[PDB]
Amino acid sequence: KRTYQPSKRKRKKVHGFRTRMSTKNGRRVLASRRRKGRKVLS
Amino acid sequence: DARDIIKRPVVTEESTSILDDKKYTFEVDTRATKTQVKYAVEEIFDVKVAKVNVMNYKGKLKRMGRYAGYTNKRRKAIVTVTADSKEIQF
Amino acid sequence: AIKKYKPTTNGRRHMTSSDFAEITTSTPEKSLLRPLKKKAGRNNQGKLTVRHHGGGHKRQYRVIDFKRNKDGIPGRVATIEYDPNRSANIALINYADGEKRYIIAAKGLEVGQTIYSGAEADIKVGNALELKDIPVGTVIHNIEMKPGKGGQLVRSAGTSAQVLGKEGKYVLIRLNSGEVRMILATCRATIGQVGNEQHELINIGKAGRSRWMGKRPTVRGSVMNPNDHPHGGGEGKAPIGRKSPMSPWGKPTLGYKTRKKNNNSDKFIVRRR
RNA sequence: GGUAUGAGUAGCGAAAGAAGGGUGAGAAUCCCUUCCACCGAAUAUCUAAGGUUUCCUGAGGAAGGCUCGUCCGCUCAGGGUUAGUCGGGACCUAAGCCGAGGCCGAUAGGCGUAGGCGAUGGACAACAGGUAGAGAUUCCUGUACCAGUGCUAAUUGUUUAACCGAUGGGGUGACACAGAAGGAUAGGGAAUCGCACGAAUGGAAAUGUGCGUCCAAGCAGUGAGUGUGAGAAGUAGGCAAAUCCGCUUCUCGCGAAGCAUGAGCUGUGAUGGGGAACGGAAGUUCCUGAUUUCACGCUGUCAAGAAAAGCCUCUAGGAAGAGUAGUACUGCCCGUACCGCAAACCGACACAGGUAGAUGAGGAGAGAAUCCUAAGGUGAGCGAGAGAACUCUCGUUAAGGAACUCGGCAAAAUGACCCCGUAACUUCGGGAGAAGGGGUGCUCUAUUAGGGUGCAAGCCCGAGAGAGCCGCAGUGAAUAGGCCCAGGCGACUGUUUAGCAAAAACACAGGUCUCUGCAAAACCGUAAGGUGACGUAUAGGGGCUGACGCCUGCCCGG
RNA sequence: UACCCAUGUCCAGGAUGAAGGUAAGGUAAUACUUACUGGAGGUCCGAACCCACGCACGUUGAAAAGUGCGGGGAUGAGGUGU
Ligand SMILES: [Mg+2]
Ligand SMILES: [Mg+2]
Ligand SMILES: [Mg+2]
Ligand SMILES: [Mg+2]
Ligand SMILES: [Mg+2]
Ligand SMILES: [Mg+2]
Ligand SMILES: [Mg+2]
Ligand SMILES: [Mg+2]
Ligand SMILES: [Mg+2]
Ligand SMILES: [Mg+2]
Ligand SMILES: [Mg+2]
Ligand SMILES: [Mg+2]
Ligand SMILES: [Mg+2]
Ligand SMILES: [Mg+2]
Ligand SMILES: [Mg+2]
Ligand SMILES: [Mg+2]
Ligand SMILES: [Mg+2]
Ligand SMILES: [Mg+2]
Ligand SMILES: [Mg+2]
Ligand SMILES: [Mg+2]
Ligand SMILES: [Mg+2]
Ligand SMILES: [Mg+2]
Ligand SMILES: [Mg+2]
Ligand SMILES: [Mg+2]
Ligand SMILES: [Mg+2]
Ligand SMILES: [Mg+2]
Ligand SMILES: [Mg+2]
Ligand SMILES: [Mg+2]
Ligand SMILES: [Mg+2]
Ligand SMILES: [Mg+2]
Ligand SMILES: [Mg+2]
Ligand SMILES: [Mg+2]
Ligand SMILES: [Mg+2]
Ligand SMILES: [Mg+2]
Ligand SMILES: [Mg+2]
Ligand SMILES: [Mg+2]
Ligand SMILES: [Mg+2]
Ligand SMILES: [Mg+2]
Ligand SMILES: [Mg+2]
Ligand SMILES: [Mg+2]
Ligand SMILES: [Mg+2]
Ligand SMILES: [Mg+2]
Ligand SMILES: [Mg+2]
Ligand SMILES: [Mg+2]
Ligand SMILES: [Mg+2]
Ligand SMILES: [Mg+2]
Ligand SMILES: [Mg+2]
Ligand SMILES: [Mg+2]
């Protein structure tokens, strides 16, 4: 039994866009990934 | 408008096999409800629609020389006209 | 009465239980039930703040009338019921006007008895009066501290307090602990010892039974490492190698008094226990 | 970064293949056939997750595939997923999360009320056939149901108020665990019936062989049963009100009725559908029988067992339209392919690992064990020889029998059922399967006696004995305890160093000390707010000791 | 992964026979005895399942902790899903 037991819901609830937006530090992360120019935020 | 909702007919072995059964397969706007498709088909073709079945197709991933990407997502509507209703031609 | 189980297993070997003789129904009053979820000693931060709680049997809360407000109207004791939330049994009171309430079941409270609350209530067991109305020497329970707040002080199985005197707008009560303190005289109490007094004799018998009651195991400080507990560490068993036995959070824990030194209620305590 | 060396070396990832035919430039490896072999409480059938096109068809054979390759989960093209009723949303709430105002706080923010979100739970209407390169309770056929809508027709109502009816009241919804006995039905089996055959090598025209031996929801009946004293008055309660609930009193009392529920059954559905054989026959009776259902129904226990919507009812309110029948019409969005004990998911791999749930046949059996099989699935992506050392995994072994070794480590032995018999000690439960012994196949008496089932017919189960008969051996295979004596430690079942320690360590019931009078002490937090506890000294926190028995001495100078 | 919360779900088969109950005795009434009933348990044996005691093997592994043969628990201080 390995780490990484995927769940669509758990992935979005923990790491998704709306969760990131819901906190100030979450928004810092989005701002940082936009600054680096990532294709994929969240 | 009605001709926004109905994009184009679908011509395949499957689509062409059910024309004799008075079932007409269209590619319809991805936002169009099967109710909007019913009333659009009636406006465009002057027919009486018995039922509309609808299905969403997700985009198919296609490569072309180290560039990969998805074809368009499609919404396919099968429109059954009534016995008394006139046919659509294709 | 206490039933002693025969030693058919090492688990049952010294176990004892209530016979639940006093219980008259196994079915609570549906209207007086509230949901109750286990907290398992966790705060509003989700952090464990009290150790050794978690994972007992599911329970429903029974709404208990600790206020005993319903003055004048007679209440017939309809049943004595098991309450998983407290050591005492509870009694369903059918009031003559068709209101049902639960009270703490006093010792000697029988189905069919009638109870009253207020100034005209007799000094008969499950009756509730203001302390100014209760004779000196009477044995009471479910004592309120602030008028109309509800009984807080002597509620657990088998406990009882005694009215000692009447000193101004205050009555002197000897509480179950043997502390003598002043209660405001417009506070009310119920007459009689609480009931289910056998409760303390029960031998839980096996580890599992403590787990059903929601108690998780206690680990002794002296078998923890030094980063976990002041008693932690040492090669082999160690004595308490400290000037005092300590709590897990420092602080001496044998004799060290913890009642706040400058306590507002100190003026109402006449004899400490 | 490139390229050597080791080296044509290690390895090629658990397993049964064979031949004939085909295809093709080319074949151990692709296709077909036949035989053989393997799984079969799975290596079968569903299905959630997860994956995301891997699915189907046609081309292909650079690379990928541990070999090969004409083949592929690979490459390239086209295709493929159909819902009022299935699962999710337009319904409900749990944990939890967010949270207008609010409380708290250098900033940021933290907390929290109303109110929301949130299934893993509640509620909620469709079945059987057909069809097929790829979907099907979705398409088609037949027959339904749920919620609406208009249109006809009567009917009744239109201010002592048909009817609707709360965002309010009440009831239900609404719940643990264990056990026992039943009813029924799935399933299983045997005869019966139908159809086909009549046979290779000695025999058989039949106790012969093979194959088959039926069907939905809905609608209308019924029904094992399971619960449930009814009626009337009267009202300090149910935030107003109440005809409803609750409470009281009175009359009438009974395992009888009603009233609720209720598996299943019978009709219809069906002149239909399916069916052993381009065709359409039989559908019966009996036995067995659930891990399903009636149903957490009943009984018991203590550890005392969600909520909300929904549904029903009550009024407060709103009201000229309302229902009934018939007719035809209306019913949105999302998912639907395929894999799913796996080569498609998690493990970098086409990886001996991991992956919830439903179903899971027969013989013998208590059984989902075991061995062999059914349905169904599979022969495992290197092979051909050889049959040295050595290694691993196995089988056997003269005489001896622990002499081995740190140590009987390993292996051997024991093993099922029935019967006999069973010590010290003991907390009286145990110890105990102690130990130690004996039996076990087949035939006849024998549709035995005697059970179960049934109206019968029959069908099933079935001892004890007597005679006999074969083997070296009868739980003839497979699967099933080795035992005893004595001591240390720990009372006990539990727990632990994921990946070198499972223990004498931890825990534990019990003991004791101590703190704590409730805005408790203790604990988290700057605080608010919390836990403690919706508890209240028979309670809660902390220290030490650790079942039970007998006990627990002296010292208070530090 | 640890603990916890809410809500689900799983545990073939067999064995034993606690309390309680009933009936006989028994007694002034009781203790009590015997039989039947009853179905308790961190109960017993044993698959699934969970675990990980011994040994072997593996040790540029089939595997960055496994496999094989034995082993322990298996209605609970149980396992497991969301
Ligand atoms: Mg990953
Ligand atoms: Mg759809
Ligand atoms: Mg504690
Ligand atoms: Mg340690
Ligand atoms: Mg240490
Ligand atoms: Mg320290
Ligand atoms: Mg120390
Ligand atoms: Mg020492
Ligand atoms: Mg070499
Ligand atoms: Mg070599
Ligand atoms: Mg080699
Ligand atoms: Mg291989
Ligand atoms: Mg098996
Ligand atoms: Mg394919
Ligand atoms: Mg190759
Ligand atoms: Mg090909
Ligand atoms: Mg909540
Ligand atoms: Mg709320
Ligand atoms: Mg929601
Ligand atoms: Mg398919
Ligand atoms: Mg259709
Ligand atoms: Mg309830
Ligand atoms: Mg499918
Ligand atoms: Mg694999
Ligand atoms: Mg598992
Ligand atoms: Mg087969
Ligand atoms: Mg020998
Ligand atoms: Mg010999
Ligand atoms: Mg020796
Ligand atoms: Mg030697
Ligand atoms: Mg030696
Ligand atoms: Mg030695
Ligand atoms: Mg050994
Ligand atoms: Mg023996
Ligand atoms: Mg045998
Ligand atoms: Mg131990
Ligand atoms: Mg143990
Ligand atoms: Mg370790
Ligand atoms: Mg170990
Ligand atoms: Mg506080
Ligand atoms: Mg100790
Ligand atoms: Mg203790
Ligand atoms: Mg759970
Ligand atoms: Mg056990
Ligand atoms: Mg060891
Ligand atoms: Mg094993
Ligand atoms: Mg054991
Ligand atoms: Mg066992």
UniProtKB/Swiss-Prot annotation, chain A:
It holds the Pfam family Ribosomal_L34. Residues 1-42 are annotated as: Disordered. GO terms for cellular component: ribonucleoprotein complex; ribosome. This is Large ribosomal subunit protein bL34. Keywords: Ribonucleoprotein, Ribosomal protein. GO terms for biological process: translation. The keyword RNA-binding does not apply. Coiled coil: none annotated. GO terms for molecular function: structural constituent of ribosome. Belongs to the bacterial ribosomal protein bL34 family. Residues 1-18, 25-42 have a biased composition (Basic residues).
Curated annotation (Swiss-Prot), chain B:
One of its GO terms (biological process) is translation. It comes from the Bacteria. Keywords: Ribonucleoprotein, Ribosomal protein, RNA-binding, rRNA-binding. Pfam families: Ribosomal_L23 (PF00276). SUPFAM superfamilies: Ribosomal proteins S24e, L23 and L15e (SSF54189). The keyword Oxidoreductase does not apply. One of its GO terms (molecular function) is structural constituent of ribosome. Part of the 50S ribosomal subunit. Contacts protein L29, and trigger factor when it is bound to the ribosome. HAMAP family: Ribosomal_uL23_B. Belongs to the universal ribosomal protein uL23 family. This is Large ribosomal subunit protein uL23. It comes from Listeria monocytogenes serovar 1/2a (strain ATCC BAA-679 / EGD-e).
Swiss-Prot record, chain C:
It holds the Pfam family Ribosomal_L2_C. Keywords: Ribonucleoprotein, Ribosomal protein, RNA-binding, rRNA-binding. InterPro entries: NA-bd_OB-fold, Rib_uL2_dom2, Ribosomal_uL2, Ribosomal_uL2_bac/org-type, Ribosomal_uL2_C, Ribosomal_uL2_CS, Ribosomal_uL2_dom3, Ribosomal_uL2_RNA-bd_dom. SUPFAM superfamilies: Nucleic acid-binding proteins, Translation proteins SH3-like domain. Residues 23-54, 220-273 are annotated as: Disordered. The keyword rRNA-binding applies. Gene3D superfamilies: 2.30.30.30, Nucleic acid-binding proteins, Ribosomal protein L2, domain 3. One of the primary rRNA binding proteins. Required for association of the 30S and 50S subunits to form the 70S ribosome, for tRNA binding and peptide bond formation. It has been suggested to have peptidyltransferase activity; this is somewhat controversial. Makes several contacts with the 16S rRNA in the 70S ribosome. Part of the 50S ribosomal subunit. Forms a bridge to the 30S subunit in the 70S ribosome. Belongs to the universal ribosomal protein uL2 family. This is Large ribosomal subunit protein uL2. It comes from Listeria monocytogenes serovar 1/2a (strain ATCC BAA-679 / EGD-e). The gene is rplB.
